[PDB]
Amino acid sequence: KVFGRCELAAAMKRHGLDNYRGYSLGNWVCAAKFESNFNTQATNRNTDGSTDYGILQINSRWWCNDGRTPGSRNLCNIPCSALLSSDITASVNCAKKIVSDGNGMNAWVAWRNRCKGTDVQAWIRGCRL
Ligand SMILES: O=C(O)c1cccc(C(=O)O)n1
Ligand SMILES: O=C(O)c1cccc(C(=O)O)n1
Ligand SMILES: O=C(O)c1cccc(C(=O)O)n1
Ligand SMILES: O=C(O)c1cccc(C(=O)O)n1
Ligand SMILES: O=C(O)c1cccc(C(=O)O)n1
Ligand SMILES: O=C(O)c1cccc(C(=O)O)n1
Ligand SMILES: O=C(O)c1cccc(C(=O)O)n1
Ligand SMILES: O=C(O)c1cccc(C(=O)O)n1
Ligand SMILES: O=C(O)c1cccc(C(=O)O)n1
Ligand SMILES: O=C(O)c1cccc(C(=O)O)n1
Ligand SMILES: O=C(O)c1cccc(C(=O)O)n1
Ligand SMILES: O=C(O)c1cccc(C(=O)O)n1
Ligand SMILES: O=C(O)c1cccc(C(=O)O)n1
Ligand SMILES: [Cl-]
Ligand SMILES: [Eu+2]
Ligand SMILES: [Eu+2]
Ligand SMILES: [Eu+2]
Ligand SMILES: [Eu+2]
Ligand SMILES: [Eu+2]
Numbered sequence: 001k002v003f004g005r006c007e008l009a010a011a012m013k014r015h016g017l018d019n020y021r022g023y024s025l026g027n028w029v030c031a032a033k034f035e036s037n038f039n040t041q042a043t044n045r046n047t048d049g050s051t052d053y054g055i056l057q058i059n060s061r062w063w064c065n066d067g068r069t070p071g072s073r074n075l076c077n078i079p080c081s082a083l084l085s086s087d088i089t090a091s092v093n094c095a096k097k098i099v100s101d102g103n104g105m106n107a108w109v110a111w112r113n114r115c116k117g118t119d120v121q122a123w124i125r126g127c128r129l
Contacts, residue, residue, distance in 0.1 A: 001086040003038040003055070005029055006127035008088070013129050015092040021099050025129075026120030027111070028095075032056055033123065034110035041084050054083040054091050056098075056108065063094055075101065 003011070009029045012018070018025045035057040036042035044052045050061035050069045060069040064080035076094035083091045098107050105111050 001040045003032070003040070005033065005038065005123055008032055008038060008055075009124045009127045010129050011088050012092065015089060016096070017092060018129075020096060021104065023099065023105055024120060026123040027105060027115060029123040030115035030118070030120045031105060031108045031111035034114040035108055040086055040088070043084070051080065053080045054085075055088055056083075056091050056095050057110070058083050058091060058094055058098070063098060 009025055012028050013025055017028045032038055032055050036055050038055065040055050042054060042057065044057065046052065046059065048061060050059050051066055052059045053064060053066070058064055058076070058080070060066040060072055060080050062073050063076045064078050064083055065072045065074040066080035076097055078090060078094060083094065099105055101107070105116070
């Protein structure tokens with residue numbers, strides 16, 4: 001599924017991301033925008049053989065187990081396939097662990113390079129939350 005930005009904002013708010021760890025809702029919507037282009041089924045293989053999965057491009061070296069990334073730490077204790085769901089719950093559960101693991105939202109490189117420090121509230125403009 002490809003989410004609308006407001007559709008996703010509302011779902012993210014329902015799953016507790018409005019100011020989670022001090023990151024306003026617009027930060028989370030913007031992260032999804034530039035990580036996955038709002039696509040719940042996005043996948044991208046990395047040079048190290050790991051793959052980034054889903055709406056928040058959660059990677060199989062550190063966060064989820066895809067069975068094909070030798071040495072996966074699987075810090076969210078979940079199959080990566082769960083993170084490709086049309087429903088964002090498992091991805092949000094895991095994102096809350098990622099964001100609190102040492103580097104804040106800097107874990108999301110696309111967020112760092114396109115979202116961090118910008119007027120991220122613009123990403124939730126007009127939305128019914
Ligand atoms: O994500 C959405 O649902 C969305 C995004 C922009 C505009 C609208 C709208 O006007 O409905 N809805
Ligand atoms: O694509 C959309 O965002 C959309 C389409 C129809 C109605 C609505 C709405 O009521 O938000 N939103
Ligand atoms: O009964 C429900 O399904 C319900 C209640 C509040 C919000 C929402 C929602 O926004 O999906 N859904
Ligand atoms: O994703 C959802 O939970 C959803 C989608 C459309 C309408 C509603 C609702 O009215 O609860 N909830
Ligand atoms: O938590 C929710 O929003 C929820 C749960 C079950 C069904 C629905 C629905 O059909 O909207 N919504
Ligand atoms: O968890 C954090 O450290 C955090 C959260 C939001 C913004 C910032 C910041 O500007 O440093 N830091
Ligand atoms: O697997 C990793 O992420 C890793 C391994 C060695 C060094 C570093 C590092 O310094 O980030 N990171
Ligand atoms: O994305 C990463 O490289 C990452 C994630 C968690 C821990 C570490 C690390 O300890 O290097 N590195
Ligand atoms: O190659 C890596 O493991 C790497 C690269 C940039 C940042 C980090 C990190 O924060 O762990 N790790
Ligand atoms: O771009 C906007 O300012 C906007 C878009 C959709 C709805 C609304 C609104 O209901 O205020 N505002
Ligand atoms: O969230 C919104 O709907 C919004 C935000 C900024 C400006 C406007 C506007 O000028 O209508 N609307
Ligand atoms: O407060 C607002 O965001 C607002 C108020 C009136 C109209 C609109 C609009 O048409 O977008 N937006
Ligand atoms: O499914 C949708 O189109 C949707 C869901 C929540 C908010 C909005 C919105 O603000 O447009 N649109
Ligand atoms: Cl915001
Ligand atoms: Eu809409
Ligand atoms: Eu519902
Ligand atoms: Eu590292
Ligand atoms: Eu900080
Ligand atoms: Eu308006």
